[PDB]
């Protein structure tokens, strides 16, 4: 149960583009602000950016590190997140999480990111 | 912005104690926190408890009570009372701000 | 100035023998029931009133019991008071009445937890405890005592939130309730049983509750009603409605809570503390010995002068020991059949409109005057 | 003296809501000026919520006074989310129903906080029923309101934040920093509690009933011999530090063994600076706190209240008379014992329930104190009494004594159990002051009146020489010479007046003009009414 599940991890070119999608399951998708969370192969965790709900106006947030190069949206009736990535760079490598945020601000539920390959 | 610091391996034998830090920024000393686990192969990390400012934690639903916090000013601590073998891993802090979070680098908790 | 002793029925002898006991109206402890005193401007006018303890005077005990979860053991210790109790107070009076009444707190949501289950069952489910209630007059006093023991050995224990509790509010209406308690013109002791502190007025305003305490009896079917509408008394509320009613405090409480009622004490003229068994089980000698230590003392009360006169106090007590000022008010170590004297000055700074007014000087814990009545010249 | 008594503007409410229960001024300034008032047991048209209570606004110089109900919340209580997931059916997981909310009412600049302390709620996990705090905080004029609840928490149940009731007392910083006492954190310790109105912004996730304001200050939990204390009974705020950031003094009153004690803490940190204890057990030390800067040393002053105080008559009977106690603050830090005390006069009358600032009421160069007797007076309707500032601090006995105009009734008044000051609603340049009178579901607006000083002398001829601080060009006075009298207009920026042809007394003219604001002047302290030869 609770279940989000990444797709449209791929091996692509540096200055290319990407699109990444989560799917969520079992839980109200338009009552949580979901959130990307990005590990490169051998390395800590990097919160990408995330994405609030209708009472806070679908308001959107990103790290400096992807600034003006990713974009986030949302399908509250498809239950579904999307992560739009330009201009890719190699730094961009790594398995890219979909999450939820609580109102004591944890993640409580995590997916099982996809791999994304930025190389020559 | 949130600066959060740990150190990057810490130690004990099957059955004793473990304390990992992590330090805020000191301008965000009251700061509360999450601890994740995520060393496990290749998994996603998985949300261990909340540590408050003034010591008061919450623990995930499934935490075996092994797991415990406690706070120092702008330090934070997770307690493992008595290694497992399953609790060897990557722990990681972290902290939200107003305008989004951060993570700390990580900590390995390793059997001798 | 002049004065004129008007009434003088003397002090009792004491008493002879079983033949003819007396009623409490008959026995006389204060001298001079009533004088007249002309005053004369700035003149200071001095009066004696001697005192002497009666032998055999009644007395009326009430006990008044926290009946919160805490107390369960306490409560069948308390089973047997109804004789024991009887039998112990025996060799101190001919005429001795015994009366029980029960309380927790407030029925109102910061006080109690207010969820369907804590209503029915205040306590973990593994305790039988009854739904909360302020105060309950299980017994008014009573000389048969055997029917003490009937009625408060089928109590049942209940249980409430906050660790200080609503006995304040059962203080009052034991007070103020008068011949619903069923109260004589005796002795008059109250024993207060309790292992917690003392919720008082402005612990309402948690609650909602602003009204201050009138001060009435509101009991209906021997319940208290309205604990949710009028707000805890302060003491110095109780300090007026227990000294105004004749009662004599004995606060019989925990080893823990001592430091608390020991100034409660210092506060309320006339009462005691004794350290209560976690288990009640000292609870005869603890009366005995609070009521050997009430009954000892004399305290002189007056009625509010009017404008301009003043009064002070001398008195005169046993093995040489006297006293002046606000301790001249005071006498100690008054023995069975023992005598105590009081000097009292009255003086005056203004001569005003009526010719006359009257006060009575009354010895607290008793219903025995002096009537002063000045003449201004 | 000051304020005008004789004929004060009465706002009035629905009977039985208990409105005047707290007071407020709304953008005290040259436009949109208003007062707020609450009625914690008002109706209000929320889906299934019965005696919710209501906050007022009031706008100031429309001459009927009306007042209209502010919807800050217009929602029932909500539901759980398993309960209308299931065949068993609906659950509330709130009770709304009795809150009182509008019994705390604080304003800053366009910014209201209303609270609802007797609020509760079902915990989502399990049956309770804990008294946790809320309130809600409007922005830029209505604009956005926020439900800031800081002690609902997943610390749950009497011996956590159960119990808390956030917004029993609150306030305002400078600076528009939000304030509040919960006296029932911790198994009655009670707890103070403090964030910025961009921190309760930044925190809003409405989905979350159990909601992180991160950067939030709080007093930590203590060992058990500190349980019962009640810390924030009641908050104020003054700079006590020497920094820039105002500190909180709150109120203990049954803390000390039941003696009662005040307790400052520092702004920025929440750490505690200094502590006061009450003189006798059991009288309600800390009931009201006040701060201000009595005796002008450009330091605020510490004020105290304990209503149930007792002392005894010079005969020798003891009374309930409550009591004031007043700290001047030094450059070196406060005294730990009372520089002055302030005793009432009337048995159960309960001085000291209310404190207020009056500003400097008199423009004497001394702010003055307002303070409430909820029960005093001949007939216990309840009184005010304004004590003047001066350089020893408060004078020991009042400049003005405030009573109801009205007859008393069934039941009390409590005339006085609320006041607000030091604010200036007709904006003639003097303070106004609002008392609240909530059992006849009342609420009094007193207004400061021109001053003006004067001078006069006999020169066998006489002069006059007067003048006013914000009072108008001409200046209305009557004279006698004792015999002649006469009727003068005496110019507020004139050096002297005079005429030619014993006594000389004079006064205003009592039926002279009534100023552009609907007042008269007063005449000042001291200045030399009649002078004789
Ligand atoms: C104005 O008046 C008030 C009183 O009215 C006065 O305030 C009291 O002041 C005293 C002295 O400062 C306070 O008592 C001290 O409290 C300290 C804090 O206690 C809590 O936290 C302790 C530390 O653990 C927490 O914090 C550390 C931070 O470093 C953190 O790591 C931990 O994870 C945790 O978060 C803790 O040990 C302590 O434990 C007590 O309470 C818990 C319940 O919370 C209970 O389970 C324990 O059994 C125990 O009773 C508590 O949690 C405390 O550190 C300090 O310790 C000293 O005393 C002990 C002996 O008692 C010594 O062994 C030790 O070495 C220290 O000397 C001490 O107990 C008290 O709490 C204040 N009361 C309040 C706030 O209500 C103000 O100071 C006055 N202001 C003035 C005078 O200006
Ligand atoms: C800040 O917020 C407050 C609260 O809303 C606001 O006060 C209110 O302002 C409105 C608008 O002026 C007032 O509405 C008026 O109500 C009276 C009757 O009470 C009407 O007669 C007024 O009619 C005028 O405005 C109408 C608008 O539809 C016109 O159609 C009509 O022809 C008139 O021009 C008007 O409706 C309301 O009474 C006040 N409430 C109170 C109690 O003050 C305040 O104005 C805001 N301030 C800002 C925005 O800075
Ligand atoms: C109420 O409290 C009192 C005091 O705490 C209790 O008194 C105690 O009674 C017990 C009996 O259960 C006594 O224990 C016995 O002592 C003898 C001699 O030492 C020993 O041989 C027995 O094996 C047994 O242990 C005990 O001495 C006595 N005093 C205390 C303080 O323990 C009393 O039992 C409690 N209950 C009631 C209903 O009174
Ligand atoms: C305290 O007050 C009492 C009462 O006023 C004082 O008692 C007085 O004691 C003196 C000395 O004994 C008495 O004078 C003599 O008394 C004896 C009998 O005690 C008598 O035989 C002598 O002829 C002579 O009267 C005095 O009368 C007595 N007064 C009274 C009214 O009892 C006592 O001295 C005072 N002590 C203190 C504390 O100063
Ligand atoms: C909020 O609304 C409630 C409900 O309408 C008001 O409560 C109602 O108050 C009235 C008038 O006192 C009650 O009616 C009276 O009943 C008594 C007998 O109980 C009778 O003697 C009178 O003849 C009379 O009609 C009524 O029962 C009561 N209803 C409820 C549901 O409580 C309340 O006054 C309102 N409060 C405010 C602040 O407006
Ligand atoms: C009320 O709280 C404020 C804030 O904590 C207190 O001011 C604080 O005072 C300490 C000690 O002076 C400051 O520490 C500083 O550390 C820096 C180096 O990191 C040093 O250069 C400074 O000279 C100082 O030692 C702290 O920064 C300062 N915080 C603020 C916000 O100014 C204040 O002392 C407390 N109230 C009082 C006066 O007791
Ligand atoms: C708690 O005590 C009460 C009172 O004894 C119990 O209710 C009584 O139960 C007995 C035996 O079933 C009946 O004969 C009485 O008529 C009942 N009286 C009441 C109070 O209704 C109750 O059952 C007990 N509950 C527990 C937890 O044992
Ligand atoms: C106890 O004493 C009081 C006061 O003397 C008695 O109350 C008075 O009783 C008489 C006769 O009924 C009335 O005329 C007075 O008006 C009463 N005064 C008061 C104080 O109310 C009371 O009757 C006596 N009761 C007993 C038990 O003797
Ligand atoms: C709590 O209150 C008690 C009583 O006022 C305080 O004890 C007093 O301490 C002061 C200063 O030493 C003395 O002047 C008083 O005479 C003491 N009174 C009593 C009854 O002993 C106690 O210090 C207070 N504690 C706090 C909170 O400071
Ligand atoms: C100047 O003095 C006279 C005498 O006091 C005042 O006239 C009386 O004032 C008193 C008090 O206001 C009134 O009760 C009397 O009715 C007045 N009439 C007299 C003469 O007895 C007069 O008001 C004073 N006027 C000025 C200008 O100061
Ligand atoms: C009473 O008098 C006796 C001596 O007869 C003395 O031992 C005892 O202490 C006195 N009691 C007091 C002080 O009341
Ligand atoms: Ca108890
Ligand atoms: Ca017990
Ligand atoms: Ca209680
Ligand atoms: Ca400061
Ligand atoms: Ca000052
Ligand atoms: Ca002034
Ligand atoms: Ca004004």
């Known amino acids: 149960e609770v279940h989000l599940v990444e797709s449209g991890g791929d091996l692509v070119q540096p200055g290319s583009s990407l699109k990444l999608s989560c799917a969520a399951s079992?839980?109200?998708?338009?009552?949580?602000?979901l959130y990307w969370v990005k590990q490169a192969p051998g390395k800590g965790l990097e919160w990408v950016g995330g994405?609030?709900?209708?009472?806070?106006?679908?308001?959107?947030e990103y790290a400096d590190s992807v600034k003006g190069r990713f974009t986030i949206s949302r399908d509250d009736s498809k239950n579904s997140l999307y992560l739009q990535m330009n201009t890719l760079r190699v730094d961009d490598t790594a398995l890219y999480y979909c999450?939820?945020?609580?109102?004591?601000?944890?993640?409580?539920?995590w997916g099982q990111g996809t791999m994304v390959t930025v190389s020559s | 912005l949130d600066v959060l610091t740990q150190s990057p391996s810490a130690s004990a034998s099957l059955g004793n104690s473990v304390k990992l830090t992590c330090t805020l920024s000191s301008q965000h000393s009251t700061y509360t926190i999450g601890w994740y686990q995520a060393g496990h192969p290749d998994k996603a990390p998985k949300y261990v408890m909340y540590l408050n400012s003034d010591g008061s934690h919450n623990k995930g639903d499934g935490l075996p009570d092994r797991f415990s916090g406690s706070s120092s000013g702008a330090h934070r601590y997770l307690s493992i009372s008595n290694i497992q073998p399953e609790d060897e891993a990557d722990y990681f802090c972290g902290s939200s701000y107003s305008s989004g979070y951060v993570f700390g680098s990580g900590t390995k908790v390793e059997l001798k | 100035g002049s004065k004129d002793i008007k009434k003088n029925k003397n002090v009792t002898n004491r008493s002879k023998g079983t033949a003819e006991k007396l009623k409490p109206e008959d026995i006389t402890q204060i001298q001079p029931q009533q004088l007249v005193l002309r005053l004369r401007s700035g003149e200071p006018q001095t009066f004696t009133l001697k005192f002497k303890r009666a032998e055999d005077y009644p007395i009326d005990l009430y006990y008044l019991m926290d009946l919160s979860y805490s107390m369960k053991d306490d409560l069948e210790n308390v089973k047997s008071l109804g004789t024991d109790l009887m039998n112990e107070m025996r060799r101190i009076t001919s005429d001795f009445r015994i009366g029980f009444g029960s309380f927790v707190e407030k029925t109102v949501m910061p006080y109690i937890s207010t969820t369907p289950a804590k209503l029915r069952n205040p306590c973990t489910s593994e305790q039988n405890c009854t739904s909360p209630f302020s105060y309950k007059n299980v017994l008014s006093l009573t000389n048969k005592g055997e029917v003490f023991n009937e009625l408060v050995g089928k109590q049942r224990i209940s249980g409430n939130l906050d660790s200080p509790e609503g006995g304040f509010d059962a203080i009052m209406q034991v007070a103020v309730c008068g011949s619903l308690i069923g109260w004589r013109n005796v002795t008059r002791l109250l024993v207060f049983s309790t292992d917690a502190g003392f919720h008082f007025a402005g612990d309402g305003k948690l609650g909602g509750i602003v009204l201050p305490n009138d001060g009435q009896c509101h009991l209906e079917n021997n319940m208290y009603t309205m604990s949710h509408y009028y707000d805890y008394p302060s003491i110095a509320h109780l300090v007026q409605k227990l000294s105004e009613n004749n009662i004599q405090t004995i606060f019989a409480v925990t080893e823990e809570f001592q430091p608390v009622y020991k100034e409660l004490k210092n506060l309320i003229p006339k009462s005691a503390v004794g350290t209560l068994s976690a288990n009640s089980s000292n609870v005869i000698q603890l009366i005995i010995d609070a009521y050997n230590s009430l009954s000892s003392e004399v305290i002189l009360e007056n009625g509010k002068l009017s404008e301009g006169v003043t009064i002070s106090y001398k008195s005169y007590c046993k093995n040489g020991v006297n006293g002046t000022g606000e301790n001249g008010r005071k006498c100690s170590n008054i023995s069975i059949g023992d005598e105590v004297q009081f000097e009292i000055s009255i003086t005056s700074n203004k001569c005003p409109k009526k010719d006359s007014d009257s006060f009575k000087i009354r010895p607290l814990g008793f219903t025995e005057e002096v009537e002063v009545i000045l003449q201004y010249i | 003296f000051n304020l005008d008594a004789e004929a004060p503007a009465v706002l009035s409410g629905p009977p039985g809501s208990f409105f005047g229960f707290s007071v407020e001024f709304y953008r005290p300034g040259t436009d949109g000026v208003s007062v707020l008032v609450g009625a914690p047991k008002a109706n209000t048209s929320q889906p299934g919520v019965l005696q919710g209570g209501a906050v007022y606004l009031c706008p100031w110089g429309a001459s009927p006074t009306q007042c209209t109900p502010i919807e800050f919340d217009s929602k029932g209580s909500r539901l759980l989310e398993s309960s209308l997931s299931s065949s068993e059916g609906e659950e509330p997981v709130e009770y709304k129903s009795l809150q009182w909310f509008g019994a705390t009412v604080r304003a800053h600049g366009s910014s209201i906080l209303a609270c609802a302390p007797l609020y509760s709620w079902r915990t989502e996990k399990e049956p309770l029923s804990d008294p946790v705090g809320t309130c809600y905080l409007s922005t830029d004029n209505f604009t956005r309101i926020l439900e800031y609840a800081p002690c609902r928490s997943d610390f749950s149940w009497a011996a956590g934040q159960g119990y808390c009731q956030g917004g029993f007392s609150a306030e305002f910083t400078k600076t528009g920093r939000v304030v509040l006492g919960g006296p029932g954190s911790y198994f009655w310790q009670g707890q103070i509690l403090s964030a910025t109105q961009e921190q309760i912004a930044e925190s809003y996730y409405p989905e979350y009933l159990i909601n992180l304001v991160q950067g939030q200050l709080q007093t930590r939990q203590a060992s058990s011999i500190y349980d019962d204390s009640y810390l924030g009974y009641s908050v104020a705020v003054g700079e006590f530090s020497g920094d820039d950031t105002e500190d909180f003094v709150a109120g203990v009153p049954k803390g000390n063994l039941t003696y009662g004690y005040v307790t400052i803490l520092n702004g920025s940190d929440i750490r505690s600076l200094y502590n006061f204890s009450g003189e006798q057990m059991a009288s309600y030390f800390g009931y009201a706190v006040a701060a201000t800067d009595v005796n002008g040393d450009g330091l605020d002053d510490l004020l105290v209240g304990a209503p149930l105080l007792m002392d005894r008559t010079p005969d020798g009977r003891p009374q309930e008379v409550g009591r004031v106690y007043v700290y001047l603050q030094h450059p070196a830090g406060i005294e730990p014992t009372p520089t002055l005390t302030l005793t009432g006069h009337d048995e159960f009358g309960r001085f000291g329930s209310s404190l207020t600032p009056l500003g400097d009421l008199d423009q004497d160069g001394y702010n003055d104190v307002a303070i409430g007797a909820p029960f005093g007076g001949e007939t216990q309707q309840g009184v005010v009494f304004v004590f003047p500032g001066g350089p020893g601090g408060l004078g020991s006995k009042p400049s003005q004594v405030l009573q109801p105009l009205w007859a008393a009734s069934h039941t009390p008044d409590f005339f006085g159990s609320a006041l607000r000051g030091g604010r200036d609603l007709d904006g003639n340049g003097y303070p106004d002051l609002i008392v609240g009178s909530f059992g006849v579901d009342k609420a009094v607006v007193y207004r400061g009146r021109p001053i003006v000083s004067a001078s006069a002398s006999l020169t066998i001829s006489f002069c006059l020489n007067a003048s006013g601080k914000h009072v108008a060009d001409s200046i209305g006075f009557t004279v006698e010479l004792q015999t002649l009298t006469q009727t003068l207009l005496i110019q507020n920026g004139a050096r002297e007046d005079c005429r030619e042809m014993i006594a000389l007394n004079f006064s205003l003219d009592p039926q002279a003009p009534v100023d552009s604001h609907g007042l008269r002047p007063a005449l000042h302290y001291q200045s030399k009414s009649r002078i004789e030869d």
């Open positions: 994405l609030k709900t209708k009472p806070n106006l679908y308001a959107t």
């Open positions: 079992g839980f109200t998708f338009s009552n949580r602000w």
């Open positions: 999450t939820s945020l609580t109102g004591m601000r944890y993640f409580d539920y």
